[PDB]
């Protein structure tokens, strides 16, 4: 009879301090623990509820302190596995306010997943298997490594002890202060006590990692750890980490409080990285940089990833959301701070130019009924994991950028600094942030509209002479009335007569402003800094289209990208015809800049991905031919080198890949020649990294080229090269080779299971592989859920990646029928609702627009 029937823990027993002893065995793959937790109770209780999941509790005792008067008593242990709780029943009720210590002895098995205290493996360059043990606790997995009050507002200090063999190294959040030999071949490592922090930030790793280190100007020792064969790839991240940690310290004037910061590259890792305080962890591909083989986008990504994890030391670690319903206070800030910090530390990366793309990523999910408000209730672990999504990260960062532009950077920064100082070593809610911002204008009412309602507004612009009428309505996909949503929208605009950014706060359904003089055109949402889209009535879109085709330089590159995106979003709600949007996209014939070119691809590629899964080869082929002809001049100018800026290199790589994939013969023939030479070199030839995706993708189209690529994958130490080979192998039209890739990465021996979600999605996007990938997901669902967990973005990626390009009623019924059959093991996943809604929109969109597109292509206006 379990004496607690709620997922959330009681509020009236609070921990202060944990002493954790962990004894792991990497041979038998087991671990033993002794957890001591100092607690106080605010209410007389005889029962202590806490979290424990897959731990075998052998004994629990309660201690009542005092030098000579110290007494100890046994606790009866009950378990409620589905609530992931245990109950410790004491003989006598606890006395309110006095300190007790709970002592729990337990055992467990190292996890075979990517969470908890889990096993990771790698092979020596000689083929020898090595095993390490590492942790991943966020959000709710600390309870798989030690019993605890495993909710983020039960903060406490942690003294961690690790018993290990002499031959292995242990590292944890804090510096190692003492090592003591405790038996033959067993050493006990003592790490210093942590600051007050949440359970999900506890970390420890037992490994044979090597390290490199460098000291910040503030005296913090920063180290990168990696397997011996890869530690010579750690230099870039080490330098970036020192520069970025110094930036944050100087920026906020709030020092990093720990003596050291480690960055550990783990051979198996589910997410990109994790911000454990003092011991941040990473996929190898998110941290390790090979100067000969890594891509420009991987160098950018490492820099932004380190910036993200270091931002968390303030936004997440020092200040933590009170509950996962406000996870965006961690993840939206960390995402935003990537851009604040790297725009200063690495100005050559020009990252601010890319930021608005994150907003358009958010709008993809946020246009669907199945989105959710930025702040929204969650309770169970699957729902909590679902909060780690593009709404929390990208919408979160986007509405922060919008607010910063509205308040100004200096006022915004003053608010953030006060927020961090006031709530240091404590927890915050949505409302605490607005209070801090306002203490420096009704920020709270405004920002409640952006955090407590899902979605975003369509702003409609109607001009009569100097009179500029504005209307807001809720953007709802499928096509005009909605649930009366209303926002406080900080509008911006420029005109043909003024490129000063003008500002107007729209707080009502309708309003108007008066221009000083009549203008030839007006353009709202300058730089795409606002989380809204714009429609222009009357001649507006015709006129902005002529602007793009005549002097597309009248507005900025990101303003051009914003017009491309908005035009195609308006097609899906019936405010603009597909033909008018495609007419606008023809201006891309003369576009040179990466953001508008990439935005054009982001709107047009999905159209032929839908066609690929239908009996539509003729229109599909014509559409792809249109796309190549549209960009042919830019493609033809690309050099087959690694020259130029990061932006020039990323643009080059994607254009050459696109051209080769669509059989543009000039590019195919060059890629074939490079691939033949690479093979004849036995893989010893150094290809330009920027052409390697295209070269490998073409080479993999034959059996001998595919087999040769796979043969080289075995021995590569380069995360970029391994990603490029994986991408190429998934492009084959040989269905038995596609099945092999699914089987082998599912197995995890020749290709690590951490790559499986990506491989499944790439085959799902393959014009001949998509039936195989969808079949594989259905057949292997239970094991995939066991490995990756319900609610994980891994599972969401697999679900969307195998289904969200379907566009027929029969495919829709397959999707609805399968996921409905899962009951409590998947039927209620939010990603399932999102993919179903996406298929429903795809059906309507194709039914309405396919013949329109066919006729438009026949008009050969290009």
């Amino acid at each position: 009879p379990f004496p607690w029937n709620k997922i959330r823990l009681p509020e009236y027993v609070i921990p202060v301090h944990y002493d954790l002893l962990i004894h792991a065995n990497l041979t038998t793959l087991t671990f033993w623990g002794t957890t001591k937790v100092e607690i106080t109770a605010s209410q007389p209780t005889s029962t202590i509820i806490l979290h424990s999941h897959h731990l075998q509790i052998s004994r629990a005792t309660l201690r009542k302190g005092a030098g000579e008067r110290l007494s100890e008593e046994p606790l009866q242990v009950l378990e409620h596995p589905r609530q992931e709780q245990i109950a410790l029943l004491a003989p006598e009720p606890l006395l309110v306010g006095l300190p007790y210590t709970v002592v729990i002895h337990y055992a467990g098995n190292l996890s075979e997943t990517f969470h908890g205290f889990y096993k990771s493996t790698y092979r020596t360059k000689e083929g020898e298997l090595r095993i390490l043990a590492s942790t991943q606790f966020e959000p709710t997995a600390a309870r798989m490594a030690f019993p605890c009050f495993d909710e983020p507002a039960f903060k406490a200090s942690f003294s961690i002890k690790i018993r290990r063999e002499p031959r292995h190294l242990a590292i944890s959040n804090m510096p190692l202060v003492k090592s003591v030999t405790v038996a033959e071949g067993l050493i006990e490592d003592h790490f210093d006590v942590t600051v007050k922090m949440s359970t999900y930030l506890v970390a420890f790793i037992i490994s044979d990692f090597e390290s490199v280190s460098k000291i910040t100007k503030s005296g913090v020792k920063v180290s990168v750890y990696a397997v011996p064969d890869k530690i010579n790839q750690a230099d870039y991240a080490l330098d970036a980490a020192v520069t970025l940690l110094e930036f944050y310290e100087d920026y906020f004037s709030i020092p990093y409080p720990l003596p050291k910061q480690d960055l550990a590259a783990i051979p198996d890792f589910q997410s990109g990285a994790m911000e454990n305080w003092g011991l941040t962890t990473y996929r190898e591909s998110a941290l390790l940089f090979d100067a000969e083989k890594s891509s420009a986008s991987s160098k950018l990504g490492i820099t932004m990833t380190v910036a993200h994890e270091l931002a968390h030391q303030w936004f997440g670690n020092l200040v933590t959301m009170e509950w996962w319903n406000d996870l965006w206070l961690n993840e939206g800030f960390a995402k935003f701070m990537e851009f604040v910090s790297v725009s200063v530390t690495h100005p050559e990366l020009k990252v601010g130019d890319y930021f608005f793309g994150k907003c358009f990523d958010a709008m993809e999910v946020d246009a669907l009924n199945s989105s959710h408000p930025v702040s929204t209730p969650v309770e169970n672990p699957a729902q909590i994991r679902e909060m780690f999504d593009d709404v929390s990260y990208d919408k979160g960062a986007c509405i922060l950028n919008m607010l910063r532009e509205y308040l100004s950077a200096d006022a915004f920064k003053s608010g953030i600094v006060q927020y961090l100082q006031k709530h240091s070593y404590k927890n915050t809610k949505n409302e605490d942030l607005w209070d801090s911002m306002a203490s420096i204008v009704d920020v709270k009412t405004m920002m409640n509209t952006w955090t407590l309602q899902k979605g975003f507004p369509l702003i409609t612009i109607t001009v009569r002479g100097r009179n500029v009428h504005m209307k807001q309505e809720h953007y709802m996909k499928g096509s005009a009335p909605d649930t009366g949503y209303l926002w406080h929208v900080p509008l911006t605009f420029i005109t043909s007569k003024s490129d000063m950014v003008h500002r107007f706060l729209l707080k009502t359904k309708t309003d108007v402003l008066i221009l000083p003089e009549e203008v030839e055109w007006i353009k709202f949402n300058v730089g795409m800094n606002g989380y809204y889209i714009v429609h222009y009535e009357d001649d507006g879109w015709d006129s902005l289209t002529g602007l793009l085709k005549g002097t597309h330089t009248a507005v900025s590159s990101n303003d051009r990208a914003s017009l491309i995106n908005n035009a195609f979003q308006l097609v899906s709600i019936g405010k603009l015809s597909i033909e008018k949007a495609l007419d606008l996209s023809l201006y891309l014939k003369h576009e040179t800049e990466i953001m508008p070119v990439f935005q054009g691809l982001n709107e047009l590629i999905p159209m032929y991905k839908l066609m690929e899964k239908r009996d539509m080869n003729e229109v599909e082929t014509q559409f792809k031919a249109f796309l190549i002809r549209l960009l042919r001049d830019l493609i033809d100018k690309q050099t087959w080198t690694d020259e130029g800026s990061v932006s020039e290199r990323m643009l080059r790589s994607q254009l050459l890949l696109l051209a080769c994939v669509h059989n543009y013969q000039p590019c195919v023939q060059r890629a074939e020649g490079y691939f033949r030479k690479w093979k004849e070199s036995n893989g010893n030839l150094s290809l330009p990294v920027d052409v390697t995706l295209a070269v490998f993708a073409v080479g993999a189209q034959s059996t001998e080229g595919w087999d040769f690529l796979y043969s080289k994958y075995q021995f590569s130490l380069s995360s970029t090269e391994k990603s490029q080979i994986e991408f190429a192998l998934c492009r084959t039209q040989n269905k038995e080779k596609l099945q092999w890739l699914l089987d082998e990465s599912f197995k995890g021996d020749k290709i690590k299971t951490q790559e499986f979600p990506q491989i499944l999605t790439l085959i799902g996007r393959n014009p001949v592989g998509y039936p195989l990938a969808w079949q594989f997901l259905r057949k292997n669902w239970n094991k995939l859920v066991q490995k990756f967990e319900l609610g994980s973005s891994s599972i969401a990626h697999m679900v969307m990646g195998t289904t969200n390009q379907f566009s027929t009623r029969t495919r829709l019924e397959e999707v609805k029928g399968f996921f409905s059959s899962l009951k409590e093991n998947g039927s209620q996943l939010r990603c399932v609702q999102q993919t179903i809604e996406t298929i429903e929109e795809n059906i309507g969109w194709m039914d309405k627009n396919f013949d329109k597109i066919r006729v438009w292509l026949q008009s050969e206006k290009l």
Binding site: G272, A273, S285, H308, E331, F388, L693, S723, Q724, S793
Partner: peptide, 9 residues
């Protein structure tokens, strides 16, 4: 973390 696909360049 979420955004880890940039190696695939």
């Amino acid at each position: 973390x979420k955004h880890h696909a940039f190696s695939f360049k």
